[PDB]
Scaffold this active site. Structure first.
Site, PDB file in Angstrom:
ATOM      1  CG  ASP A  25      36.893  76.620 -27.238  1.00  0.00           C
ATOM      2  OD1 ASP A  25      38.069  76.258 -27.424  1.00  0.00           O
ATOM      3  OD2 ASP A  25      36.420  76.837 -26.101  1.00  0.00           O
ATOM      4  CB  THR A  26      40.085  73.305 -31.496  1.00  0.00           C
ATOM      5  OG1 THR A  26      41.160  74.113 -30.989  1.00  0.00           O
ATOM      6  CG2 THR A  26      39.698  73.784 -32.877  1.00  0.00           C
ATOM      7  N   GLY A  27      39.366  73.761 -28.182  1.00  0.00           N
ATOM      8  CA  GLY A  27      39.802  73.454 -26.838  1.00  0.00           C
ATOM      9  C   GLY A  27      38.685  72.960 -25.958  1.00  0.00           C
TER      10      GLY A  27
HETATM   11  C1  3T1 Z   1      37.025  85.163 -25.664  1.00  0.00           C
HETATM   12  O1  3T1 Z   1      36.650  85.401 -24.273  1.00  0.00           O
HETATM   13  C2  3T1 Z   1      37.151  84.540 -23.292  1.00  0.00           C
HETATM   14  C3  3T1 Z   1      37.947  83.417 -23.561  1.00  0.00           C
HETATM   15  C4  3T1 Z   1      38.419  82.612 -22.536  1.00  0.00           C
HETATM   16  C5  3T1 Z   1      39.272  81.351 -22.880  1.00  0.00           C
HETATM   17  N1  3T1 Z   1      38.352  80.223 -23.290  1.00  0.00           N
HETATM   18  C6  3T1 Z   1      37.291  79.918 -22.545  1.00  0.00           C
HETATM   19  C7  3T1 Z   1      36.084  79.992 -23.264  1.00  0.00           C
HETATM   20  C8  3T1 Z   1      34.880  79.763 -22.578  1.00  0.00           C
HETATM   21  C9  3T1 Z   1      34.921  79.475 -21.205  1.00  0.00           C
HETATM   22  C10 3T1 Z   1      36.132  79.446 -20.491  1.00  0.00           C
HETATM   23  C11 3T1 Z   1      37.322  79.666 -21.160  1.00  0.00           C
HETATM   24  N2  3T1 Z   1      38.388  79.600 -20.348  1.00  0.00           N
HETATM   25  C12 3T1 Z   1      39.637  80.143 -20.566  1.00  0.00           C
HETATM   26  C13 3T1 Z   1      40.068  80.922 -21.662  1.00  0.00           C
HETATM   27  C14 3T1 Z   1      41.384  81.407 -21.705  1.00  0.00           C
HETATM   28  O2  3T1 Z   1      41.731  82.059 -22.689  1.00  0.00           O
HETATM   29  C15 3T1 Z   1      42.395  81.179 -20.538  1.00  0.00           C
HETATM   30  C16 3T1 Z   1      42.056  79.872 -19.799  1.00  0.00           C
HETATM   31  C17 3T1 Z   1      42.975  79.623 -18.606  1.00  0.00           C
HETATM   32  C18 3T1 Z   1      43.904  78.595 -18.688  1.00  0.00           C
HETATM   33  C19 3T1 Z   1      44.734  78.335 -17.603  1.00  0.00           C
HETATM   34  C20 3T1 Z   1      44.663  79.116 -16.440  1.00  0.00           C
HETATM   35  C21 3T1 Z   1      43.750  80.177 -16.380  1.00  0.00           C
HETATM   36  C22 3T1 Z   1      42.893  80.417 -17.457  1.00  0.00           C
HETATM   37  C23 3T1 Z   1      40.584  79.833 -19.385  1.00  0.00           C
HETATM   38  C24 3T1 Z   1      38.053  82.910 -21.222  1.00  0.00           C
HETATM   39  C25 3T1 Z   1      37.256  84.028 -20.920  1.00  0.00           C
HETATM   40 CL1  3T1 Z   1      36.864  84.330 -19.238  1.00  0.00          CL
HETATM   41  C26 3T1 Z   1      36.799  84.831 -21.977  1.00  0.00           C
HETATM   42  O3  3T1 Z   1      36.010  85.952 -21.802  1.00  0.00           O
HETATM   43  C1  3T1 Z   2      40.912  69.255 -22.012  1.00  0.00           C
HETATM   44  O1  3T1 Z   2      40.792  69.212 -20.582  1.00  0.00           O
HETATM   45  C2  3T1 Z   2      39.995  70.284 -20.169  1.00  0.00           C
HETATM   46  C3  3T1 Z   2      39.416  71.177 -21.108  1.00  0.00           C
HETATM   47  C4  3T1 Z   2      38.595  72.237 -20.684  1.00  0.00           C
HETATM   48  C5  3T1 Z   2      38.043  73.191 -21.779  1.00  0.00           C
HETATM   49  N1  3T1 Z   2      39.211  74.088 -22.127  1.00  0.00           N
HETATM   50  C6  3T1 Z   2      39.932  74.718 -21.155  1.00  0.00           C
HETATM   51  C7  3T1 Z   2      41.338  74.527 -21.216  1.00  0.00           C
HETATM   52  C8  3T1 Z   2      42.173  75.115 -20.249  1.00  0.00           C
HETATM   53  C9  3T1 Z   2      41.640  75.889 -19.194  1.00  0.00           C
HETATM   54  C10 3T1 Z   2      40.239  76.053 -19.124  1.00  0.00           C
HETATM   55  C11 3T1 Z   2      39.381  75.479 -20.115  1.00  0.00           C
HETATM   56  N2  3T1 Z   2      38.067  75.732 -19.897  1.00  0.00           N
HETATM   57  C12 3T1 Z   2      36.945  75.083 -20.298  1.00  0.00           C
HETATM   58  C13 3T1 Z   2      36.866  73.998 -21.194  1.00  0.00           C
HETATM   59  C14 3T1 Z   2      35.614  73.501 -21.568  1.00  0.00           C
HETATM   60  O2  3T1 Z   2      35.511  72.508 -22.312  1.00  0.00           O
HETATM   61  C15 3T1 Z   2      34.319  74.014 -20.913  1.00  0.00           C
HETATM   62  C16 3T1 Z   2      34.470  75.495 -20.574  1.00  0.00           C
HETATM   63  C17 3T1 Z   2      33.215  76.116 -19.949  1.00  0.00           C
HETATM   64  C18 3T1 Z   2      32.464  77.004 -20.737  1.00  0.00           C
HETATM   65  C19 3T1 Z   2      31.309  77.612 -20.203  1.00  0.00           C
HETATM   66  C20 3T1 Z   2      30.954  77.372 -18.876  1.00  0.00           C
HETATM   67  C21 3T1 Z   2      31.715  76.497 -18.102  1.00  0.00           C
HETATM   68  C22 3T1 Z   2      32.835  75.849 -18.628  1.00  0.00           C
HETATM   69  C23 3T1 Z   2      35.715  75.772 -19.686  1.00  0.00           C
HETATM   70  C24 3T1 Z   2      38.376  72.430 -19.293  1.00  0.00           C
HETATM   71  C25 3T1 Z   2      38.937  71.548 -18.352  1.00  0.00           C
HETATM   72 CL1  3T1 Z   2      38.614  71.846 -16.669  1.00  0.00          CL
HETATM   73  C26 3T1 Z   2      39.766  70.479 -18.800  1.00  0.00           C
HETATM   74  O3  3T1 Z   2      40.373  69.568 -17.975  1.00  0.00           O
END
Ligand code: 3T1
Ligand code: 3T1
Ligand code: CL
Lengths: 99, 99
Positions: A25-27
């Protein structure tokens, strides 16, 4: 290795004698892995997603392995919808994005 | 280019004539961008993260340019803490992870 994005970038991560499937996860800044029993001390931490905060246990200075590459870093243990390897460990295995 | 992961992988994207900053996000299937004006018809969608779901508008066949690479695909518009380029578009421009 070269990992395509045509499907989710899933790997086996080894931490000691425990195996977990995880999403590269690069995000994400941090690594979050659900439901595992690391030994020793941890620090409490709140981490945020779109709808609020999850409480996790922060484990520092952990030896991990991913596809034959060893790395050292922080693992966050707590409930996550998927196990994720964030940049803290991606940089430690020398992983880059290429296009 | 090659993009190391020491910093968040934020790139400029060109979409609907405007330049926006977006996170390259191998942890997401789909591309989600802050409310912007896109012309034409859209399909309602709900996308999940931590704690719930956000209502988004799904637009197909959107021209998006990232670091010179012109792609055409599906963009979801709505509230998000960061603009995210997901695998649908990342794989479209031949992005891979390498270590
Ligand atoms: C591969 O499985 C999952 C991947 C992800 C994706 N990656 C995350 C991995 C771990 C924790 C949480 C996120 N969160 C988000 C992800 C998304 O793909 C959409 C993103 C989003 C952005 C904007 C507005 C609404 C939502 C939220 C989420 C879930 Cl719940 C998954 O089961
Ligand atoms: C880059 O800026 C952000 C990046 C992210 C990260 N990438 C996402 C980008 C867009 C929408 C949502 C996610 N979500 C998650 C991310 C994480 O780094 C932690 C992840 C997490 C996993 C397990 C349990 C709890 C949380 C949820 C989140 C926020 Cl709120 C940001 O402002
Ligand atoms: Cl989230």
């Amino acid at each position: 290795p070269q990992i395509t994005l045509w499907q989710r970038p899933l790997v086996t991560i080894k931490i000691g004698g425990q195996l977990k499937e995880a999403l590269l996860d690069t995000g994400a800044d941090d690594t979050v892995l659900e439901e595992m029993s690391l030994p020793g001390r941890w620090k409490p931490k709140m981490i945020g997603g779109i709808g609020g905060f999850i409480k996790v246990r922060q484990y520092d200075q952990i030896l991990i392995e991913i596809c034959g590459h060893k790395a050292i870093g922080t693992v966050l243990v707590g409930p996550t919808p998927v196990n994720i390897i964030g940049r803290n460990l991606l940089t430690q295995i020398g992983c880059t994005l290429n296009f």
